Design a protein around this ligand. Sequence first.
Ligand SMILES: Cc1ccc(C(C)C)c(O)c1
Length: 149
Amino acid sequence: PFELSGKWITSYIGSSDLEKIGENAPFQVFMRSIEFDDKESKVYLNFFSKENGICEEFSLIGTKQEGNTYDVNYAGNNKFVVSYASETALIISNINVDEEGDKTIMTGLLGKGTDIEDQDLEKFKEVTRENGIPEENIVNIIERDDCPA
Ligand SMILES: Cc1ccc(C(C)C)c(O)c1
């Protein structure tokens, strides 16, 4: 029996648009926890992000939709799916349409905290590639995450 809810920390993030994941960008997301509430058809996301170099915390709520996607508002509109789930990781695929109407596909590897399993990393790189995102568009978040636990 797989437990998807709980503590999840971001390891890596891939993006079709580099402007969304660099320094202090909306999508350089340092995840802390994800709680799935199938009973109420919602998902709870807690994470840190940086603006002006300082850590800011967000606690969002997404709504479960068709298939096994989730809609959530943040720096525009987002539709994400947990593409992969193991005992040690989660790989999220997200499609963001920002305020300007520009569409960006992104991927993220989440783990239980800092020590990455290569088996999970290879699946993330594979998912990222399948989404048309180049290897050079992958950022190592572990090295950038200096926000509070
Ligand atoms: C809406 C949304 C989508 C994706 C992520 C990470 C997987 C990068 C979020 O933190 C939030």
